[PDB]
Amino acid sequence: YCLEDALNDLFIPETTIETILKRLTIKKNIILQGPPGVGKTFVARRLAYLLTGEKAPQRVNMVQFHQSYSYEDFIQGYRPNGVGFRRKDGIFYNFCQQAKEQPEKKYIFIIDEINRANLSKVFGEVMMLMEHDKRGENWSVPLTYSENDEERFYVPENVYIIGLMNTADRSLAVVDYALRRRFSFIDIEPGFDTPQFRNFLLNKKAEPSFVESLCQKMNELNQEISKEATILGKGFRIGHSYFCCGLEDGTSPDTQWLNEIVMTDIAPLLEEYFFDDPYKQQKWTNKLLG
Amino acid sequence: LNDLFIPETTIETILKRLTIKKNIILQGPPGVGKTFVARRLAYLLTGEKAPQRVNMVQFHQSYSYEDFIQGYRPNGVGFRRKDGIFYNFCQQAKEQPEKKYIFIIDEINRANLSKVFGEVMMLMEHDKRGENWSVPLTYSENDEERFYVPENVYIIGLMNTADRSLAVVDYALRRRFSFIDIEPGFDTPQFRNFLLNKKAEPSFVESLCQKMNELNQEISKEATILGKGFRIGHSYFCCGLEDGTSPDTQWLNEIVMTDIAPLLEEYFFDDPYKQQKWTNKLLG
Amino acid sequence: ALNDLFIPETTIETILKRLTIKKNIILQGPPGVGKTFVARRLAYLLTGEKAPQRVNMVQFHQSYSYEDFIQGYRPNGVGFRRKDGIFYNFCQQAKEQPEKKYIFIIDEINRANLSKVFGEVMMLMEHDKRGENWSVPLTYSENDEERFYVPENVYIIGLMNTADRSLAVVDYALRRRFSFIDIEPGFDTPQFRNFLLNKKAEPSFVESLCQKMNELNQEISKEATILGKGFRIGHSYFCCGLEDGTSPDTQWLNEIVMTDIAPLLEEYFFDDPYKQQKWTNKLLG
Amino acid sequence: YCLEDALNDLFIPETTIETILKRLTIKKNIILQGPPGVGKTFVARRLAYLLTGEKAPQRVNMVQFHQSYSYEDFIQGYRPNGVGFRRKDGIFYNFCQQAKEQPEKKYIFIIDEINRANLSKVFGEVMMLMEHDKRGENWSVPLTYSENDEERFYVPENVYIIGLMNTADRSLAVVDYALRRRFSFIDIEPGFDTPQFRNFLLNKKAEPSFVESLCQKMNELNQEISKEATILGKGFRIGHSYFCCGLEDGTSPDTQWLNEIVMTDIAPLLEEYFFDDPYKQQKWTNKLLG
Amino acid sequence: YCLEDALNDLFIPETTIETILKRLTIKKNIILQGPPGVGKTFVARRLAYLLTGEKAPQRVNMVQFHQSYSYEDFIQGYRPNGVGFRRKDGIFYNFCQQAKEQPEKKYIFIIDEINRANLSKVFGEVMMLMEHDKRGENWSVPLTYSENDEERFYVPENVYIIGLMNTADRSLAVVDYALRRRFSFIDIEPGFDTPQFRNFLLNKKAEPSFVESLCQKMNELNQEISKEATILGKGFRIGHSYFCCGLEDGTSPDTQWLNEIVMTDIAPLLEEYFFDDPYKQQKWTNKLLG
Amino acid sequence: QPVIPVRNIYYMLTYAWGYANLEAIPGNNLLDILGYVLNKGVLQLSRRGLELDYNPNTEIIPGIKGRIEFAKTIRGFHLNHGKTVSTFDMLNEDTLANRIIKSTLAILIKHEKLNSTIRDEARSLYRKLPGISTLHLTPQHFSYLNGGKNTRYYKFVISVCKFIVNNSIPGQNKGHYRFYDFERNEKEMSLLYQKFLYEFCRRELTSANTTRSYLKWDASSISDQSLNLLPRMETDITIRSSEKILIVDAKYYKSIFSREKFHSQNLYQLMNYLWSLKPENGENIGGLLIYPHVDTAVKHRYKINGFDIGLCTVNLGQEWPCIHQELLDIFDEYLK
Ligand SMILES: Nc1nc2c(ncn2[C@@H]2O[C@H](COP(=O)(O)OP(=O)(O)NP(=O)(O)O)[C@@H](O)[C@H]2O)c(=O)[nH]1
Ligand SMILES: Nc1nc2c(ncn2[C@@H]2O[C@H](COP(=O)(O)OP(=O)(O)NP(=O)(O)O)[C@@H](O)[C@H]2O)c(=O)[nH]1
Ligand SMILES: Nc1nc2c(ncn2[C@@H]2O[C@H](COP(=O)(O)OP(=O)(O)NP(=O)(O)O)[C@@H](O)[C@H]2O)c(=O)[nH]1
Ligand SMILES: Nc1nc2c(ncn2[C@@H]2O[C@H](COP(=O)(O)OP(=O)(O)O)[C@@H](O)[C@H]2O)c(=O)[nH]1
Ligand SMILES: Nc1nc2c(ncn2[C@@H]2O[C@H](COP(=O)(O)OP(=O)(O)O)[C@@H](O)[C@H]2O)c(=O)[nH]1
Ligand SMILES: [Mg+2]
Ligand SMILES: [Mg+2]
Ligand SMILES: [Mg+2]
C-alpha cells in the first residue's frame, strides 16, 4: 500500500491524517470522534494499511461493539464447548498472540461504535495494560480466569488500537475520565468546504456554481448547529456522506437530486434537532432549496 | 398496484430509494397497511409472489441479539451456538445471490435497536457489503470466521408513530435508514373507489373523508403533544366488508364504538367531553 | 344459558360479533363479575356443543414464562428433553379439526409480560397473520423441518380486571392485538332479578337491594382518580349461597355485607372509617 | 535496592513516601487516591521493593478489578474440569500460602482500579480478616466452599495490601464505610509544584521560563477545577503523566509540543469537563497556549 | 475465665455488657448494631468465653456473611465430585451436632456483617427452628435436602447466635424484616466519653488534658452527624478504634500522631460524608488540628 | 399582606442551585411556573438523550449471556432444565435519577391547582416513559444522588424536583395534591435569600472574593476552652477584596414590607461578627444590612463604633434585569 492511493478520494485534510499518524505512533491508542457520516469507518481500514505500509488484512481486525459484549467474549472467559465448558481465548486475546509472533509488523484492532458497550467492564485488565509506556512483559498481569499467578498476559508494543465514537449521543459518552486518558482524542469535521470533496463532484460532471452554493449552505447550517452548544454542540452537525454516495449510476448532481435527498433524510432530521421551532425547520429547509 | 390505497408516486419513490439505498423505514400510525404495503412491495421487487424469500418479524422489548443473529442456547444434550434467523436468512440469500431476499421488521421502535442488531448496524449499509467488510461476530469462536451482508439483501422497517419514547434517539441509525412517511389516504380516490366498487353511497364515502379529515387535522393541529404520526389509519374500514355487507351509516356506528373510541381515549386522555364531541361528530 | 347470565343480552350478542371477526378479545371488569363463568358459557355458546375439552384455561402470573406456555427443556430421569407447552400442545389438537372452533382462556393476563411469555408468537396471534403462510420456526425448534402456525379456528379470551389502583396504563402490546370490552356489574338487569325472584325474594327486598347497590357503585365511580368505574362492586357474591338451598333474607344479605363488601370497601377507600361505617351501616339499613 | 534508586526518577515528595510507610507498617492495608497520571500505578510496583528491600517479583502480586471479579475468582470458587466441576483455590488464597511459607519476608498484593468492583461481594470473609489486629491463627475462619473437615484461612501478618482508587469517577467510590476503616487513604497531588518534576524537564533540554510557565498555569487551572465541587471536585485536577512521556526521542519541550498536547488530549477533556459554555474552554485553552 | 481479664480493657460500660448477657441467656439470638470501630467484633469473642467460663475454641464458631453465602454451603447442600454430586453437612448443621453431645455446655456461633446477605436465602427453613421458643427436638423438621422425612434437624436450646451489623449504609435504612422478629437489636455506643477509653490512653503515657480536649471534639463531631437524618444518622457516627491502633510500639500520643490519623482516615471520610459542603470539611478538619 | 410577584422568585432559586422567557406562561402561581420549567426541562434532555446507566443483572435465563455464575447454577441444578445463573448488563433508563422524574410528575399531575395545558403535556410525558418504574419518593432518594455523577443539567431539574416534593401537601382529595404557600413563611424565604446572595456574588463579583467565614469568639473562659455553650457563629457571607473587606447579613422580615418602626433585630448579630473577626491585612472593615422591599430602595450609611455600616433595600417586583442592575450598583458603592 501507499499513502497517495488512499488520499485520492479522502475528504479529510492530510495534516489531520499526519496528526493522526503522529500521535498513533506515539500514543498507540486513539479515538476519532465526530458525527455519523464522515468516514470514520472509511478511513480506519485505510489507515491500518498506511501505518503498516502494506495492504495486509490478516494483521487487521475490525469489530463493532454493542451492549451485549463482555470481558468473557472479548478477552477470556468460560464458555460451553459442548457438554463440557472450556476457557475461550477471546478475540483480542487471539489477536495479541498473532502480534507477538511478528513483533516487527504492526497489528491493528479497529473498534466501531466503541461508546456503546460498557468499556470499563469490557477491557478491565487491558485498561491498564494498553498504555504506551506499560506495554511489555515487565508489566505482565495474571488474568481473572488464569489458572495461576504464573499465567500472565502482556500487551505487545506493536499493537495499535483505533476507536470510533460518534458524537451524536450525549447519553453514550466516554465519561470515564481515566479511560479518556488512555485514548488520544482526534476530532473530525464534516469537511464540506474542501477542494477534494468538490473535485470528486466536478469529476462526476457537476456544475461548479451548484457545488460552491451547496458547500456554503451546509457550512452555514453546521455553524448554526455549533452555535447553540447548550442544546446541540458541534458534534451533532451533519456529515458529508448523505451527498457522497448515490451518484454511482452516473446521474449528474442536479438540484432535483439534492431536493429529493433533503425530503427523504435531512428534513425529519431537522425536525428532531428542532422539535420546538417549526419556522426554523421551514427556514433552513427552504434556504437550501432557494 | 391495483387495490393499494396509497399514491403511485410514493411507491415509485420508495422503489428507487429501496433499490439504491437498500434500507428503508416506513413510519406512520397503525392501520395504514404498512404490512400489506411491504408485503405487496416485497413481491414486486422480487418479481414473483414468493413468500419463502420474504421473512417478517415483530420486535418487542425483550427481543435480543441472542435471538436475532447468534446466541448460545440449549439442545437436547446441552448448550450450543444457535444461528439466529438473520444469520440464517442472510446465509440463505448468500446461496442465491441473484434473487432479492427481503426481511421485514415490525414495531421496530419498541426495542433497543442498537442492542439487537449490534454488529450489523454497520454492515447493513449499502456500500459496506462484501467479504472486505466482513467482521467476526461477538460469539464467533474464531476471528477468521465472519459475517457479511450480501448485496441482494434489502431490509424494510415498519415503525409505529404512536409510541414515542424519550429514552433513546439515535441519529446514526437514521443515517442508514431512508425515512418515508405514510398518510392514511382517505382523500385518495383509490380508497374511495373500493367502497364505490362495494355499492357504497357516493355521499357516504365522500362524507366520511370530510369526517375523518376534520378529526385528523385536529390530531395534527397540536404539533407539540401530537402530530400527523398519531392520526387515524384507514385499514379498519378495509376489513369486515368482504363478507357481503355493503357500507351503511349503521355499519359506521359499529366501528366507532368498537375500534376508534379507545384510540381517542389514549390521545384525548382525561378529556371525556372532547371524546364525546368528536365521536358523535362522526355519527352525524 | 342466556337467561342464566346476568349482563345484557345486547353485550353478549355484541361480543360474538367482535370475537368472530377480530379473533382476539379481552374483558376488563371489577372482581366478582363472573368473568370466568361468563367466558365458559360464552365459549360453549360459540361452538354450540358445550365441550370443555375444546376449551383450555390458563391463569397468568409474573413467574409464568415461555417454557410453561409454549416449549421448554425439562429434566428427564437423566439429562433433559424438549417439553411441549400448553399452547403448542393446544393448537395442534385444534389443527386436526379446522371446522371446530377451539378456545383459550388467559386469566389475569395484565400481570405478566406478554412478550416474555409468548415470545415470537405474539404477531402470529394477530388475526390477519394465521395459517400456513405465516409459519415461523421456533426458538427451541432446532431444525427447520416443522414450523408453528396458529390456525384460524383459534379464539383467545383474556380476563383482566380494573380492580387495582396500583395498575398503571395497560401495556401497548395488548392494545393493538386485543379489543377491550368493559362489563357492567349487571345489578339493574332483569336476569339477575329473575334469579332472586325465582328464590322467592321479595320484590321490595329485590328493588331496594338493586337501589341499594346502585347508589354505592355510583359513589365509588364518582371519584375521578382513586376509584373509577372499574372499581365498582359486582354481583358474584349474591349468586353463591341462595340456590344452594337457603332462601334470601336481610340477614343473609347482612352476612354478605360483613363477608366481603365490608373488607372490600375498606381497601378501596383505605382512609376514613366513618365513610366505610356510614356505607356499611347504610347497606344494613 | 534502596530509596535513592526508587526516588531517583519519582516526582513525588519524600514526605508522602515515608508517611506512606508510616501508615502501612502499622496498618498493613492502604489506599492511594489521586487523579490519573500521578504515578499511582508507577510507584506501587516500586514500593513493593522497598519493604522487601529487594527487587523481587515473586513476593509481589499485581491485579486489576474490572467489575467482573468475584469471590469465586479472588479466593475460592468452582471451575469446570473436563466434564465435571472442581474446586479451585483463588489467587489470593494461592498468594497467601506462599506468603505464610516464610513469615520473615514481606508479601505485597496490589489491586489497581480497586474502586470499581463491589468489594464487599468479592472479599467476603476477608473484609474482617485483612485488618492488622485480626491476623494469624487466632482469628482463623472457615470459608464458604471450604471442606467439611475444618480448614481455615487467616490473613498472614507479613502481608501488605495496597489499593489504587482514582478520584475522577464519583459513582465508583467506596460507600462501604465499614470497609473504608480497614484501609487508610493517602491523597496524592498532581505533582506539578515539585522541583523534582521541574528538574526532569530542564535535564531534558527545557527552558526554566517555559518550565516555570507551565507549572504556573496548571496550578491556577486546578484551582478552577478545585473551586467547584458540584461537578468537578478537587480530585478531578489534571495529572502530570501527559507531559512526562513522548520526549524520549529527543523532542525538546516547547510550545509546539505543548500545543499538540493541548489540542489533542486535554482540550477534548476540557469540553467534556465543562460542557456548558465553550468560552470557558476557549479561555483556558488559549491561556495554556499563550 | 475471669471477667476482670475480659472486661478491663473494654471501653463499653459494664451496664451494657451485662444487659447484653441478659438477653443472650434469655433469647439466645442477638444482634449488635453499631458503626465500625467500637469493638463489636472485639467483644463478641470475649462474651462466648465469658458465658462458657473457659477459653475453648471448639464450642465457639465464627463466620462473616456476604452475598455469595447460601443455604447449600451454610446448612446442607451438594458439592460436585469429579462427576457425581455429593451431599455435605454444612457448618451450622455440623456445629449443632457437636453441641448436641454437650447440651449443658454453652455453644456459640458468631456471624459478622450479617446484613450483607439476606438471611432467608441462607437460613430459610431453619428460621422456624432458630427462634428461641421453637427450639428442641419437639419442633424437629426434615430438611429440604434430606433423602427421607425420617431424618430431622432441631436447633438445641444450648446454642446462642450472635450477629454483628454496621449502620453505615443507606440500604440498611430498610432493615430486613427477618432480623427484627427473630433477633433483638442492641446498640453499641462509640464510647469516647468513658473512663476506660481515657484510662487506656493515660496508661500509654498520655497527657490528661490532651485526652479530654479530644473527646469533646469527637463527641461534638458525632453530635453533628447524628443531628442529620436524611443523609447521615446517629448510626453513622465514628467509632473508637481509629485511635486505639498504632500505639503498640509505645509512641506517645500527641497532636502529631493525631494529625496522621486525621489526614489519612477522618478527613477523606468527611469528604465522603460532606461532599456537598467543602467548607464544612474545612470547618471540622481544621478544628481538630487546633 | 403583600408578597413578591411569583415569577421573580424563580430567578433567586436558580442562583441558589447554581443552574429565559417566562412571559409565555399565563399562570401566575408558582407551580404553574415551576412545572413549565420541569415539563420543558425534561424535553431539553430527551433531545440530547437521557442518562443510561448499566445495571448489572444476575438472573436465571435459558442460555449464556455475559458471565455465568457456576455456583448458583450447580446449587440450583439449573443445568437440568436448561438454565444458567448468569450476570449481564441490561441497559436501562430506570436509574434513581430518572425514576424520580416520573414519580415527581405523578404528583405534578395529581396537583389540584394547576394549568390544564400543563397537566395535559405532563400526562403525555408520563405515558411516554413506560419502562421506568413509579416510586413513593422520600428525601433519602434525593440524598443518595448527592454524589452527583449526573450531568450539570440533570442536577437542575432534580433540584426543581426536590422543591416540589418538599413543598407538596395533599389537598381536597386524598390522592390529589395542593401546593405549599411558600412565600408566606419567612424562614425558608429568608434562607432562600441568604443562600441566594452567596451564589449570586460569585457570578457577578468576580472582582471580589466571596466566602462564608467561620469565626471564633474573642472570649476566653477559665471553665472551658471549648466554648460550646457560646452560640455558633458563622457569617452569612463575606465578600473580601484587597482594598476592603465587607460582611453582609440579609434576612426576610414581614414588618419591613410595611414602609414606622423597623425590624433590624439581626443587626445585633452583626457587631459581634465584626468584633471577633480580626484582619491581618488591616485594609478596612465594613458591614452591610440589606433587605427586600417591594416599592422602593433606600440606602443609608453609618459610622457607629469605628465600623462602617450600611442599611439598604431592593424593590423586588420591579424587573429582574433592573434588579440585577441595582445589586451591582449597590455592592459597588459600599465596597468602594
Ligand atoms: N467516496 C468517499 N466516501 C466517503 C468518504 N468519506 C466518507 N465517505 C462515505 O461515508 C459513508 C460512511 O463512512 P463511515 O466511516 O461509516 O461514517 P461514520 O461516521 O463512521 N458513520 P457512523 O459513525 O454512523 O458509523 C460511506 O459511504 C463512506 O464511503 C470519502 O472521502 N470518499
Ligand atoms: N519518570 C516518571 N514518570 C512518572 C512519574 N510519575 C508518574 N509518571 C508517569 O506517568 C505515567 C502514568 O503513571 P500511572 O502510575 O499509571 O498513573 P496512574 O494513576 O496509575 N494512572 P491511572 O489513574 O489512570 O490508573 C507513566 O509514564 C508514569 O511513569 C514520576 O514521578 N517519574
Ligand atoms: N484495647 C481495646 N481495643 C478495642 C476496644 N474496643 C475496640 N477495640 C479495638 O478496635 C479494633 C476493631 O474492633 P472491631 O470489633 O473489629 O470493630 P468492628 O465493629 O468489628 N468493625 P466493623 O464494624 O468494621 O466490622 C480492634 O483492635 C479492637 O481490639 C477496647 O475497648 N479496648
Ligand atoms: N386494498 C387495500 N387493503 C389495504 C390497504 N391498506 C391496508 N389494507 C388491508 O388492511 C388489513 C390490515 O393491514 P395491517 O397491516 O394490519 O395494518 P398496519 O400494519 O397497521 O399497517 C390487511 O387486509 C391490509 O391488506 C390498502 O391500502 N389497500
Ligand atoms: N348461575 C350464575 N352464576 C354466576 C353468574 N355470574 C357469576 N356467577 C357466579 O359467580 C362466581 C364466579 O365469579 P368470578 O367473578 O368469576 O370470581 P373471580 O374470578 O374470583 O372474580 C361463580 O359462582 C359463578 O357461577 C351468572 O350469571 N349465573
Ligand atoms: Mg460509520
Ligand atoms: Mg494507573
Ligand atoms: Mg468487625
Residue numbers in the entry:
A (entry chain C), D (entry chain B), E (entry chain A): 168 to 457
B (entry chain D): 174 to 457
C (entry chain E): 173 to 457
F (entry chain M): 3 to 21, 28 to 267, 272 to 348
Authors' description from the paper:
McrBC is an antiphage defense system of Escherichia coli that specifically cleaves invading DNA that are methylated. GTP hydrolysis by McrBC bound to a recognition sequence powers DNA translocation, and convergence of two such complexes on the DNA results in nucleolytic cleavage.
McrBΔNC is dumbbell shaped with the two hexameric McrBΔN rings tilted with respect to each other and sandwiching an McrC dimer. Three-dimensional (3D) classification resulted in nine major classes with varying tilt angle, indicative of conformational plasticity. The catalytic residues, Asp244, Asp257, and Lys259, are located close to the dimeric interface and aligned along the FA interface of McrB. A particularly interesting feature of McrBΔNC is that the McrC stalk blocks the pore of the McrB ring.
